[model samples]
Target: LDNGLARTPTMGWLHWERFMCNLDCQEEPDSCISEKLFMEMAELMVSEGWKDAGYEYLCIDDCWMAPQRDSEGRLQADPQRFPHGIRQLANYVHSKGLKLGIYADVGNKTCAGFPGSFGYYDIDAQTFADWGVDLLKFDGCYCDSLENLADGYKHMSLALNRTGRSIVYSCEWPLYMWPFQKPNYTEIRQYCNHWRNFADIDDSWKSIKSILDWTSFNQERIVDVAGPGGWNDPDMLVIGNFGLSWNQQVTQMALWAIMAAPLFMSNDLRHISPQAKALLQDKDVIAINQDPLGKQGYQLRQGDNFEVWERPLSGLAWAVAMINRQEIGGPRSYTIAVASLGKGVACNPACFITQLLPVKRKLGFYEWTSRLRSHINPTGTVLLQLENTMQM
Candidate 1:
């Protein structure tokens, strides 16, 4: 089977459950986000070129639950918060040509103290299935017993399987899981369709740097293990969260796309500025993450505070990322030797490079192309598709 079907680099939001203060049942409930607000944000995603570019998932993060479960031991959505009900909201999202996602945990309680899906695997899965949940981000909080991690995930995986619904499972485990230790891959692959390999990501330069560092540490292992049924998730992108400058947001989006990380957006979509929209909607950059080859980039070289990694694209082309560890400096310059290109690889460099940019605008988006620069900058990246004519 082709790997494209298993890959999902589409973008959407994660509600800040912990950040929402002064929760009011009539206003905004702790267990549920108002449908009016959710619909408004979903509309903004479409308006901001997401729907046009095939970015169609709207996900809810933690705390979308009541303080207690129903008498049947099923988790309940706060009625006052979800007056129309979760299933109805899913229908509304589907009507907009978008899919709906929800969050839960494999522990006794969520990080925010909401009831989780630890022991009530079947009930929770059935509840979510009935709610039309297309995506399930199963978090690893309160799961203090490390030995139970695998079983915890497997239980949910089984539950999802029995549900007969193909809701994508995004497992958020703290362990890097890929390159650090080979054993984690075996466990992750057995349970999740996608897994977060790092700590939480935020809207800041430091967060981006941290992600790059973590990616470098595990890029190779991820490439070796990544395939149709599983993907490496670095974390969500805080592109337009009112913290960093426009350029930083663009750089963050570009890096995430090049890294082939699941493109989960944490910013409020309803108020995304034009510049933020442009970065998130950049068809060229998004193509790298959604490439048909499904191969991840690997770090080729490293310096005291600079590093270079290369992602092999469809043709012979490579998507190069140069990250800067320096905090005070502007973009730094770096280069990768042509020999560093994996020798004798089947991919023809020229064709690989060309396919990095799409030909058709499937959903009213522009096709992206690069000028094939040989050099890159510090704390920034230069992605290119190149021919393999030059011998190493």
Candidate 2:
């Protein structure tokens, strides 16, 4: 059965331990952000042109719930933190054409030692539905055994399906299981829609490099597992807020788009600068990510500190990315020949490539080489969209 949902090349923020909330609206919780602040940030998401740029979800990571369940054994939002309740917050977010997403674990307690949904799957699912949750990021932290991992995920998937609400279930089991090791993507297509193929990702260039390297190297393996209802998640994007240089942020955002990974932002939306916003909201790059064909990019070549990845776009176009992993350099250069694309030898190619530089530039065409001259920083990348080739 089809999931009845459109594949979204979505972009949004995730509030985890890094961006600690300062407001206190819940009496039971200390050192928590208030619902008022949450709403204010949601408003800023729209005001800042994210809503206009197709960023819709305003997600809460963890610790928004009280430590203990209510008298009726229901998981309750920290009344002090969310005085108006999560359902009301969902309503407010929806009013702005945005969806609400929350984080939970498949174990007894979350990674932060809070109540999880493992033992109380049904109850927690019901509560989330009642609260108008449109997405659930079920993590696998604190899980006791790998034996029960798939069963546990299946149970939650069933629960979410039973809610009669079309909730997007993003399974966060970083643990690689046997099936995942040799993933039978075709057979298990219906099991889960998305999963973290790696561990937690940070804002650092090294972290991004590692994730990209692993994903690109394992591209074919990932393809074996990808289908209509599922995706190979390389984890979230930490570009705008990771304290990296503006050039590095552009590289991070550009690489994620090229890889077609889920564009989850981990930045402070209210404080995102205009340049950062432009990098995050680049329509030309995002279009490659949201390509309706749903084909994930594959790594074509890997050099000492560089890699090339390609994803086929609609109408015979291809999105190509060249990533540099070298550290502590002023600027770097790389080349991607059309011959590497495996197109017919006689094809005359038309291409448009853009380098995410410290300064913005336009694509200049060349007739003989069929190449575009672009400069990249030490740990930067150039994204090119090649198109309209005739078989030579």
Candidate 3:
């Protein structure tokens, strides 16, 4: 949280992975970052049933502001593109029951060379509050490890709080080149609401799996830092876009939720397929993600070609996923017996389970020694919720 905001992972649609820095609006009008594009997405959040599914924030990722601050040292929206300005768009988004998020960099210039808030933290923070910006994705660019990325982001966080406005601080903390041990998890949690922990997520399943592998590879070091107010962001959802099939996209969905990550989607909402939309709106998956436990899930077990990921949920239930890692295989299975859940993952005599997504149903209680036959397609997953029998 910039200050008492985004207590949980922030969910919504972002305009970057799908509609990138298309500054030449004339050549690519439909896919550019503009007032009309945001309005259309805001409308989709309402009309297409995403708002009801906890997709609320309409975030502009980058290149929406002009290349320079105004003469008085204030950020300016690209006049030709965002003619109505950030505040106007924010109002419209708010009117539609969604929040508005903007982006900036920690250096003097943004990654794409737009004006950044390196030395103007207070003014930019104040301007954002005055403009009704509800979330800020502060990035790292044109800075070195010797420089204080922590100080830069912390200063912005303090400034945002001083503005007396509740702007969710999305510190892309992992973007900085400094080693992971520099600021320490405790310090990072104190400053950021949620942060990107690895590389920028591309639109390919290879990229998707790479992020998961890296996170899982360092799960112990990275897990406990994120909970409740702070989160480990793996980047935007590549759902409803090319470079992924339905199954691959669903795998990302299940894994991201298990990781207790944010659900900021970066795709064409208006034109998304029904299948993708349905998975995006899956209530059970969303529930696991928004679980009060707020614990980022961990890989309970990992075989050569498969893995089992589990996140503790409220009421002692657990969200478990069996993912098949191979790309060429037809299908596979991860036989997750209850013992793999550890001694603490116990119910009375048995647990009731619900198979989500492809097979949504209630499975009757089974004893702790029993095994779950989770058949998964290649690059796909089978997600289940094991509920305490006594609680049921």
Candidate 4:
């Protein structure tokens, strides 16, 4: 009931990327926003080891409901599509040991043209809580003023709190932060668990790189803003789709971990490729994301197509990501001196190096003068977790 419920960044499956507003059940029966698809995914999340790997929320985005409310002005699910209703759907998802998430907007209508929660904040908030909806994604699509966005979001948060449910509040106000309004992080953090800072991600290298580019540019102002109970959402994971190569997936996962981003998958679980599944379920990388210290890393250095990022961990440890942005001929080489990260005993050559993702193993130790010589595939990355091997 005390609503800062998402103490850590959230991990889950979102239906938007892979399955958009597919209302045509007759033409495309399986892909439509029907109860069938969601139930299938809920089972897959358990059976395919995604839930075991920390992906617990099965989020239904955009057009899951019809365009209008009922006679009493309550949000209505598409009658034919969801005959069992949202409450039943939530119970089904819960039965599989997963939570349910639904999307709404701060406007009169959602970004996908469905009924939004603009005028009916309290009503819809109560409805969601009663339906056992565990999370809400309220967008800024229809809000008249960017200033009203904050108030509107808090209004819904208050409504949810009134219902005595631990539902998480994910505000889309951050997307309205730039150009339209300079963001007030303090106020935003006061009401939201996580907010999207960029546009939607697609199944393409360009989409991935563009988001990373934005993060790199604003690293200074944004890195310190994320920690426990709140985070900077760069959007969703497009790793398992056809747009990313194995190397690209590594870049996405390692970069996300380094930035302390909420790991949300927007890919198909039932038929995801083996390599993609392995990377998604990589425990070492997941630990780095769930790091108790919760410090977000920044781009320490950049050149031609090279980068070095370091995220501070609890117990004086760090998660370092060395990245290669080029895809020309083959793998490229880069080196990082241990002494350069810090002067602490944890940063010394006697420290241990664990390769978290892609190649999961302990890479042994070296002296402070020794350099971490990494050969990265073009447009790939090497993820290393640095821990103090001895006490100071």
Candidate 5:
């Protein structure tokens, strides 16, 4: 996990699960936490295709900052809601080609209190790389322990890699040391590129089924330390807000595209919803959550109320999903069986099923002792996406 920078599992538009810390812009001027609400959400994620369906990163969570810290100690931006600062709002979100992500806190404040980064970790990592911040979430609220929250998040990840500027850290150091211990995810994947292992995502389906029941009972210590650069965030992505529906926003965008997680979208991109903007712009569920072979998927079988999830993309492809968790029952069928998708999943003779999200189509070919039925609705989800008819 060298800092080549989030090799995958990072898509964006996060302003705290639908504008939290809303510092009343003289009465919610189009939903607060200002800089004109991240410059109109980075101009509606570049004219609305969400930066060509990749969600480009326009983050900026907490109340934008400034409760005190500019007496030559940096970290300001809240001058009446970022009055042309944050290096002119990261140069108008890099003049529209997006990428800004702000937010901080590694103790001394900011779980909405602002002014954190304790002893100002290298002046707030060179004031967020001289205000051109590309990403940094940080946050671990009032740390008081965990060895100064794991040495102030590896001393602000070496003061953001000594400000060479390639931000994107996002750590909460094991979401605040996992309730109280067991958090050394191999030193948080050697200094995070994606984290927030659980909680803090509430547009409610009971807060996304208690974070998918704590990532399926901590899927053996959070699925093989995630992949590419790093990931496993299971937060944000409340799908067009106001407590899910439309099949719980297609079961939180097909379980965050089969748990390869990270796809920010805290809603309100100037009124999302052509059914939650076609499940947040599904380009085959964001190509299996940007799968560049960043594995991170499990819960392969959980019956009774239904479950099936799988993932392993990158050429040989495979995305599964299924889910149903019966809620007053209505739809629940199931059959799926490509040799139970286990043991090396050698589809034997053929594969290729499609159906990504509520309805994307083509459900044909199969062989490893074929089988396929689906149905699923109640708490809905049916993703699919097989592919290995000898790599199609």
Candidate 6:
């Protein structure tokens, strides 16, 4: 946590969701998990405004490594795919003013059956440092013992620290332990910069809503643990992918901004629509997610077919999002009493509100007794920013 990184939820592009482990370069050259793919993504990140929008890391997920270690028992990148090696790839990412992140597992083998860091903690950490890796996502798989899981994660964290390189440590220890035992967030926070606490996100609306359900259901136990240094990762954004509709995409973006979640896009940037690009690069939404306060939002109210979420920002400001969860219905209108939004909205005399997602517009000023009405599309969201008018 003291790595001085991810002080806000991490944002960037990672290729696991959209591309998966497509190592068939000869047949699927355009979508392979190779150095060329990463290089192209890094360039597009800079050229496509992702870097300017606060996305800094270009991460490679699992399957980037070879099936076997070298003679020195060191993990190696797939030679055919990464002919120039990881160090060169790191340099390329650095050249674009972005950091490079790579994945590993705490077990003997990765989820994709590649080499892991179980017995190679120090060596792997040093190797990554030597390769100029700026972030390490240490996963948990093929390792069943809970005690071993804890020890392996702790050992890796120490090894990463000893490398003298300020590499961000991302752990899946809590995620693997969550099903059988309650994860100790206090300890998890002390070790990992960010930890996944939900199921892996597939390209589907159900996956997003399932994650939202779990987080909100466990908000009381998990909310306070998230802050500047450590965060509860709900997994990647599936906005630009195939499963979600435009309205559904808006819901994901708005809810993620509310949760202060890490914004790692896993969609193919090469063919993304203009709408997805704009929503992903929305300055107002990104600002809300990267708020200096780092307070993860909580569900304010859960109604029959809707839910209201709120996050307190760094200044005397608040972000309010109304989600219409109804599957088959017209736009559902919500009449919210401004006074009920707590101190964040019940200012001295009035508050100014601006709609942030689906559309951007000034919703005018409102007093404590005012009623704010919004008609949200089914499975869509209406996000608003509320600021004390007196401060303006």
List runs of model 4 lying over 4 Å from the truth: 1-4, 342-345
In order, how many clashes per candidate? Answer: 9, 8, 2, 1, 0, 0
Model 2 residue 243 lDDT?
A: 58
Per-residue C-alpha lDDT of model 4 across residues 243-316, encoded as one tens digit per residue:
88898999999999988888889987877899899898998888888888877788888998898888888887
What does candidate 3's lDDT look like per residue over 248-300, in tens digits? Answer: 99899999999999999999987888888899899989988889879889998
Q: Using Cα atoms with residue i matched to residue i, what is each candidate's TM-score against the true structure?
A: 0.83, 0.88, 0.96, 0.96, 0.36, 0.98
Give per-residue lDDT, candidate 1, residue 59.
85
lDDT tens string, model 5, 179-269?
7887878778888888888768788788887888789888999789889898888878878878778887898888888888888888788
For model 4 the local lDDT of residue 245 reads 85
- Candidate 1 per-residue C-alpha lDDT over 1-392 given as tens digits, one digit per residue, 9 for 90 to 100: 12222564545566652234234555444223566667777887777777887677788777668789989888877676667878999998988889898888888888778887878999889989998988888887777766566678878888888898868888875352323334467567667777877777665778777877777776656667776567777877777676666546655766676667777777666566877777677777787778877777777778867666667767655665555555565655554444455443422232233322221112111112212233233444454544443232
lDDT of 2 by residue, 1-392 (tens): 14654274445666763454444434533234657666877898888888877777788877777888899888888776788889999999999889988888888887777787777888898999899998788877677676566677778888888888887777765444543355444433565667777767876767777787787667766755554456677777776675577767767776676666777777767667777888888877777777777777777788778767777766766766766677777667775556565252312454444433344455544233564445556766777766544332
RMSD of each: 5.6, 3.4, 1.7, 1.7, 16.6, 1.2
In model 5, what are the clashing residue pairs, if there are any? Answer: none
Please give the distance, in angstroms, between residue 371's alpha carbon in candidate 5 and its true position after superposition.
Answer: 3.7
Q: Which candidate's lDDT is highest?
A: 6
| Pairs with backbone N, CA or C atoms under 3 Å apart (clashes), candidate 3 | 1-193, 2-169
Give the whole-model CA lDDT for all candidates, comma-separated: 0.66, 0.69, 0.85, 0.84, 0.83, 0.91
Off by over 4 Å in 2: 20-31, 174-188, 342-373, 389-392
Clashing pairs in 6: none
Which portions of model 6 miss their true places by more than 4 Å? 343-346
lDDT of 4 at 377: 89
Name the TM-score of candidate 2: 0.88
